[PDB]
Structures are given as structure tokens and as C-alpha cells.
Amino acid sequence: QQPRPFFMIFFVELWERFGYYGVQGVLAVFFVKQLGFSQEQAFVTFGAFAALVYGLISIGGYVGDHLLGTKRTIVLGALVLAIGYFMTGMSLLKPDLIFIALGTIAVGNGLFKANPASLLSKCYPPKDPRLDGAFTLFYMSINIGSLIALSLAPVIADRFGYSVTYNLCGAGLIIALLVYIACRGMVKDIGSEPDFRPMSFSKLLYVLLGSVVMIFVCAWLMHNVEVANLVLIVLSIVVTIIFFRQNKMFVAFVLMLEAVVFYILYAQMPTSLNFFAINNVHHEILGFSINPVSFQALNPFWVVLASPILAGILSMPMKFTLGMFMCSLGFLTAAAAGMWFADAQGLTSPWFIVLVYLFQSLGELFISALGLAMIAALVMGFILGMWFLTQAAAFLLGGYVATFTAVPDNITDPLETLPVYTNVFGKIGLVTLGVAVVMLLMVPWLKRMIA
Amino acid sequence: VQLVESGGGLVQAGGSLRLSCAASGPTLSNYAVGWFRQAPGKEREFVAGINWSSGLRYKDVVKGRFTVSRDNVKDTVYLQMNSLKPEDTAVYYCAARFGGMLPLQPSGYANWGQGTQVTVSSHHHHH
Ligand SMILES: CCCCCCCCCCCCO[C@@H]1O[C@H](CO)[C@@H](O[C@H]2O[C@H](CO)[C@@H](O)[C@H](O)[C@H]2O)[C@H](O)[C@H]1O
Ligand SMILES: CCCCCCCCCCCC
Ligand SMILES: CCCCCCCCCC
Ligand SMILES: CCCCCCCC
Ligand SMILES: CCCCCC
């Protein structure tokens, strides 16, 4: 159905995302259990890590387009990522390595992420009808890899330990690299302009130097989240000032703030919703016992099933509005499950968390899948930078919000933790509902501005 | 996922016994381990437990007498039972639930030992 390089890119993306989500699914539990962080420390540290992973995505598109070429930067990103996963596995012998190892993953992700999609765009003549379907299959590739990793990595970490889990993340990257190298002949005439000139060693060294610098800066920021907060605060107010100085951009700004709220909520899946499943949900569904950390896999699960359907099935601001209503309902469902449908021992049915994740995933499919594509329809490089800055800020804010559900390690009674989750999730849902209503009200004016 | 209990037995009132729980494939370190007990003609009831990060929970009638503890090198959980009384007679079970919570009812735990008989006799020496 698709060009031959499509299948190469599909499987490279699948394996890279498997490595990444293998780490993400276990990281907060690893912080708590292996490093002895309180839940509060673990949540803010995950927030900082996630902020760096997402804010640095801006670098790899520039490196691939203008310095080294898309294909070279795919290889380099994959190699830096694999090194990061093996360093994380090594951090169990050498605990002091952990932050450097996470910085290496963040920077590796930054170099890699934009480039396969860019590559995929170049596999099709410019107005090929199959493009939409190919990109929906690309998103499904991401979520198949994520589904496998979030399902299996907690089980593997429980049975064989974290070193094995992280080494298998690294191995997934190695095999992404092997399938790329094996399929290299399929993309010989596919690439950005630097891909076809001999590699500039000057620029390669600049990229390696900057990467190493960034790895150390990332390590420091994750170790000292209290200064990452002000770094992003002052960057945010400053770039806000310079955005205001310089009206389709105003629409881009309001959609950016709405996206920020969405990402604050999305950030709860590996933290507060993860520990809610651990502490206050039954660990049994359809008669099978499961690791509750695996409940995170319900997000890619619902995306994999729902992306074709919704591909089969207003315009921009209303799709954003719908996503915000879905997210609101996910958190109100969580609160309701805890407030009214718990057992006398304080435990709730996992079908409520299945429903929570359905809502949240529909929110993802309406918003983040369809955001910067027509933020690119309203617009440049400055707004991309501000975009990535705001989404990083959203993840830091999300770690902070998650700390309101943090449970001290000595608590053992689910009836003590359930009202904490329900209060926070109910308030998140109410605030998000209010935000969704104000977006609804702004939909017509916004839709005029888009003209 | 499968726990092996050891250390039950017969003891006189005022004596002591220690039960131990070990898991096979999964490291017990990630699990809250609760001890339940079932006396003749009643339901399994929560006795005592330790979560994955040293938090403790106890039934009122065993406080000051039972101690739950954990040896994370040997991957084992222990129930040290002192000042035992006849009404502590029961089959004792260890149960394991992933994480930090120790729910009070058997349905909160997925993994179960087979059970060890503890009998406490009113036996005392003749005066
Ligand atoms: C909602 C998403 C569900 C994720 C699907 C899980 C993938 C299947 C696991 C691999 C094959 C099963 O292997 C094993 O099966 C038993 C019973 O099924 C499960 O359960 C057993 O292990 C896990 C963690 O190791 C413990 O939390 C659990 O209480 C224990 O009983 C685990 O999930 C899995 O260790
Ligand atoms: C495709 C050619 C491989 C180029 C690898 C060169 C690496 C330079 C090392 C610089 C060390 C900082
Ligand atoms: C004393 C512990 C220091 C750990 C440093 C680990 C660095 C390894 C570099 C690959
Ligand atoms: C296509 C070859 C890419 C080379 C990048 C390796 C830099 C260490
Ligand atoms: C953008 C909102 C920041 C709020 C910090 C308390």
C-alpha cells in the first residue's frame, strides 16, 4: 500500500519509541524504590526530565535540515540514545551516573525525534493522497512501540531488575539502527540537502560539543529542579515580552496556552495517575493479575484502536475544544470513581481507569496530534522555539501539580490516600472544564481570525 | 507470584514463633506483604503487614505482640509472634500486593501462600 521506505521508517520509529517508553513507564517507580526519593521528589524530577525531552526536540529538526542531513542525524540520534539507555543500565552499578544518563537520553531524543517524520514526508510525491494515511500509520507505529514498552517493561523490571530493563531499551535502539542500516538502499535519493553533500566535520564537531554541554546542563537541571523552575520562568516571561512586541499570531498564542493545560494533564499519566493505580485500584482485570504500572499502557492502547476510526471520521478550535472536554472528563471520572465507587477497603475497579484513559487518549487525538500542524497553518522559527519552551514549561508544571498527590512512604491504608487523589483529580477536572468552556466561547472569534 | 511460607507450628501460651515469606520469580522488594489468618469457622482476617518502603500496619489485638519486618537482601518478610495466646490459633497466610498499600481484605492481594498452621496451647507447667 505504501512506498518501501515507509515500512523501514515505521519500524525504526516503533523500536526507538519502545526504548523511550520502556524508560518512561518505570522511571518514577525507579526514583522512589531504587534511589529512595520521596514521591514528591520523584514527581518533580520526572517533570524536569520530561521538560528536557520535549523542549530539546527543536534542536534535531535544525540539525537534520541544515547541519548534517536528516539521515545522518537519525543515525547520530539513535547512537546517542542507545548510549543513554546503556548508561542508565550502568547507573545501577554507579548510582551517581543517573542524571547524566537521563540527560543523554534527553539530548539523544532531541536530536532524533523530528527527523523520521521529516524523512517520511520525503517518501511521497508532494500531493500524494496517501500522505494522511501514512502519517496516521506513523502515529500508530509510535503507539505500538509505546504499548509494548509500557506493558512489558514494568514486568521485566519486577522479574529481572532495572539493569535488564534499561539494557533492553538500549537493545531496542540498536535494532532500530540495524534495520535502518540494512534498509539504507531504500532512501538513497531521500533526505534533506546536507544529506547529499559530504559531511562537514566542522559542523559534526559543533554538534557533538553542544550535545555534551547539553547533557551536562540537563543533568544539572534535573538535579536542581528549583533552578530549572526559574530558568524556564524567566525564559517564559522574556519570550512572552518579545512575542508581544512583535493577529493570526495571537490565535497561535491562545492555542499555545490551551496546549499548555493539555500537557499539564498529559504529564499526570506516569506520575499521579500511575501511583493512583498503584495505591487505590484493584490489580486484576478479566481475572488476570497485572502489574499496576502497566496500566500506563492504556494510553497507547486507546490511541492504537481509535486513530483509524477517528481518521475515518468546527475545524481547528473546535477540535481543540473537544479534546479539552475529553481531558476534563477523564479527571472527573477519576474523582468520581474515588468518591462514590470504591470498596470499603478503599480500592476501585480498574474499569474506571480504563475509562479515564479512553477520555485522555481522545483528548490527545484531538489536540496534540493536530496542533503544530495547523499552528504551522497560522504562521516562524521563533514561534517554534516558544512552542517547545511552553510545552517544557507544561511538563515542569505537571510535575509540580502531581506533587499534590504525593503519599509519604509510611502510609499503608488506601482510605487515607483515596481522598487526596479524589480532591486533586476533581479540582483538575473542574479547572479543565472551565478552560474548555472559555475555549468554546472563543471558538467563533478564533475561527474568524483564521480566515 | 508464588510465595512459600515457613515457620509455623505448635507452642504454649506466652511463647513465640516466627513466620517467614519468600517469593519465587518476582523480587518481593516491590511488594507490600500482608499476613492474614483464618481461625476455625471464621474468615481470613488481616493480621499485620509491611509495604514496599517500610510502612507498617497492624490489627489492634496483635499490637505490642507481633512484629513484621523485612530482610531485603534475603528477599524475605518475617512475622515475629511473641506472647502468643490460644486465640491466635489459625492458619496464617502471606499475601503480596505491588506497592505501598496494605488493604484489609483478601481481595486486595493477588499472590497468596498456601498457609501455615499456628497452634497455641493453654498448656502450662504443673505447680
Ligand atoms: C492493562 C495493561 C495490561 C498489561 C499486560 C501485561 C502483559 C503480560 C505480562 C507478561 C506475561 C505475563 O507474565 C506475568 O503474568 C502474571 C499474571 O498474568 C502477572 O502478575 C504477576 O507479575 C506482576 C509483575 O511481575 C505482579 O504485579 C503480579 O501481581 C504478579 O502476580 C504479570 O503481568 C506478569 O509478570
Ligand atoms: C561517517 C563518518 C564517521 C565520522 C565519525 C567522526 C567522529 C569524530 C570524533 C570527534 C571526537 C570529539
Ligand atoms: C563514585 C561513583 C561515580 C560514578 C560515575 C559514573 C561515570 C561513568 C562514566 C561512563
Ligand atoms: C550516515 C553516517 C552518520 C555519521 C554520524 C556518526 C557520528 C559519530
Ligand atoms: C503559566 C502559569 C504558571 C503558574 C505558576 C504558579
Side-chain angles (χ1 to χ4, degrees):
Chain A
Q1 40 170 313
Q2 307 281 345
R4 277 291 217 200
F6 163 93
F7 300 100
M8 185 231 60
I9 287 154
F10 188 95
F11 281 97
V12 169
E13 188 65 21
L14 197 154
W15 285 103
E16 185 268 334
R17 293 286 85 192
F18 162 86
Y20 175 75
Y21 282 105
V23 166
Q24 158 165 134
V26 307
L27 191 57
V29 169
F30 175 83
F31 285 162
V32 170
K33 277 300 284 157
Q34 187 65 37
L35 309 196
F37 288 18
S38 67
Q39 279 176 27
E40 191 192 1
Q41 302 172 255
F43 288 171
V44 297
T45 308
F46 185 97
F49 174 65
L52 296 161
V53 160
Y54 287 95
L56 287 179
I57 289 163
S58 45
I59 297 330
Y62 174 63
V63 173
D65 283 344
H66 298 97
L67 303 189
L68 304 180
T70 308
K71 298 189 285 186
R72 296 208 182 95
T73 309
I74 284 169
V75 176
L76 177 68
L79 288 160
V80 174
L81 279 171
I83 287 181
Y85 295 127
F86 293 119
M87 275 159 75
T88 309
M90 246 192 84
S91 282
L92 281 100
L93 301 148
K94 324 292 224 165
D96 266 26
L97 191 59
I98 180 63
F99 289 129
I100 288 291
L102 297 176
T104 303
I105 295 163
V107 169
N109 179 81
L111 288 154
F112 183 95
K113 185 136 193 66
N115 283 294
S118 177
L119 197 67
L120 177 71
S121 157
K122 283 151 200 185
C123 291
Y124 300 79
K127 59 192 166 215
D128 191 312
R130 310 170 283 179
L131 258 181
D132 279 334
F135 269 82
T136 304
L137 294 153
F138 180 73
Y139 208 55
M140 293 177 33
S141 175
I142 292 173
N143 285 264
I144 286 155
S146 174
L147 165 62
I148 294 164
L150 294 175
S151 287
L152 298 192
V155 175
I156 291 293
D158 188 41
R159 311 266 199 160
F160 308 110
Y162 288 106
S163 205
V164 164
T165 308
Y166 295 146
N167 287 342
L168 285 172
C169 292
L173 266 290
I174 294 290
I175 90 167
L177 216 171
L178 293 172
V179 317
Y180 173 88
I181 277 173
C183 299
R184 180 145 105 194
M186 300 186 206
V187 289
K188 275 319 142 203
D189 300 346
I190 316 305
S192 60
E193 181 181 336
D195 268 312
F196 299 108
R197 298 174 292 160
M199 185 183 21
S200 152
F201 283 85
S202 178
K203 279 146 186 242
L204 173 55
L205 291 168
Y206 283 118
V207 171
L208 300 181
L209 270 48
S211 291
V212 167
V213 170
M214 277 325 288
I215 287 172
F216 279 88
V217 169
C218 284
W220 192 71
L221 288 174
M222 278 183 278
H223 184 98
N224 309 272
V225 174
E226 197 23 67
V227 315
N229 286 343
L230 304 68
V231 163
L232 253 65
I233 271 165
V234 303
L235 230 57
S236 281
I237 67 160
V238 154
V239 166
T240 285
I241 283 172
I242 88 163
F243 175 89
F244 275 6
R245 283 188 183 184
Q246 311 255 348
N247 289 337
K248 291 221 219 154
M249 306 283 103
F250 296 98
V251 174
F253 187 68
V254 202
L255 287 281
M256 263 189 330
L257 231 54
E258 312 171 343
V260 159
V261 164
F262 167 79
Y263 278 113
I264 290 178
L265 299 214
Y266 182 85
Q268 304 310 300
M269 298 196 286
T271 53
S272 67
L273 284 174
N274 183 25
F275 276 63
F276 172 70
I278 292 176
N279 288 335
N280 285 100
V281 176
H282 284 286
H283 302 346
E284 177 179 299
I285 190 171
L286 298 176
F288 320 87
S289 317
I290 66 134
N291 190 314
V293 182
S294 295
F295 279 119
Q296 294 171 77
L298 288 164
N299 163 244
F301 175 83
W302 280 125
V303 174
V304 165
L305 302 176
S307 32
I309 288 170
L310 266 207
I313 312 316
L314 325 166
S315 58
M316 170 184 327
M318 181 56 54
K319 284 168 170 154
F320 257 70
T321 302
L322 295 174
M324 190 78 34
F325 278 116
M326 294 314 90
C327 290
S328 182
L329 287 175
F331 282 85
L332 294 166
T333 296
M339 273 163 97
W340 302 313
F341 297 99
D343 254 355
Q345 62 191 323
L347 297 178
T348 193
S349 167
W351 291 108
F352 286 112
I353 204 77
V354 172
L355 185 64
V356 167
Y357 272 90
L358 172 53
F359 278 132
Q360 183 61 207
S361 299
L362 289 167
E364 172 178 345
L365 280 171
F366 285 120
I367 300 201
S368 65
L370 177 63
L372 200 53
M374 300 211 304
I375 290 298
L378 305 148
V379 174
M380 225 293 282
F382 158 72
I383 75 100
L384 285 321
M386 195 191 193
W387 167 267
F388 286 111
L389 176 62
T390 54
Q391 185 173 355
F395 281 100
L396 221 41
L397 270 169
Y400 170 65
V401 161
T403 67
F404 293 104
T405 68
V407 180
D409 308 308
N410 71 296
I411 303 302
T412 61
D413 178 10
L415 291 168
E416 280 194 15
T417 65
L418 196 47
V420 175
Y421 291 115
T422 57
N423 188 230
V424 176
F425 291 156
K427 282 178 185 159
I428 291 172
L430 291 169
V431 174
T432 295
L433 186 60
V435 169
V437 165
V438 188
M439 320 159 34
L440 176 60
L441 290 172
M442 303 277 119
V443 157
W445 183 357
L446 212 168
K447 187 151 63 140
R448 256 185 283 199
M449 299 277 236
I450 300 188
Chain B
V1 54
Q2 222 177 325
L3 324 175
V4 293
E5 300 132 345
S6 86
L10 172 66
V11 75
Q12 80 179 287
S16 298
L17 286 160
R18 151 177 92 61
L19 306 176
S20 79
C21 190
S24 54
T27 168
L28 217 44
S29 210
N30 297 321
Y31 296 78
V33 180
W35 294 92
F36 287 76
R37 75 185 175 189
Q38 197 179 16
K42 318 209 285 145
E43 325 261 18
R44 274 170 221 219
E45 60 177 20
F46 183 86
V47 177
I50 192 173
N51 77 358
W52 65 351
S53 59
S54 302
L56 306 167
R57 196 184 187 158
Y58 289 108
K59 190 197 205 58
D60 277 352
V61 296
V62 305
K63 302 199 190 165
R65 311 173 301 117
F66 291 14
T67 303
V68 186
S69 66
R70 185 208 287 277
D71 183 299
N72 265 319
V73 306
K74 258 165 96 141
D75 184 1
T76 297
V77 171
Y78 302 103
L79 183 61
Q80 176 68 41
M81 278 166 310
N82 299 331
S83 304
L84 280 165
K85 314 170 156 253
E87 59 264 43
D88 299 317
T89 290
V91 184
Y92 285 69
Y93 303 86
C94 63
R97 151 184 194 90
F98 190 101
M101 279 324 98
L102 290 157
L104 284 183
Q105 296 304 324
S107 58
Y109 303 74
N111 316 99
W112 285 85
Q114 295 277 95
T116 321
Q117 184 74 53
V118 161
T119 304
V120 185
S121 181
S122 63
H123 172 266
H124 54 99
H125 87 108
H126 187 57
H127 306 89

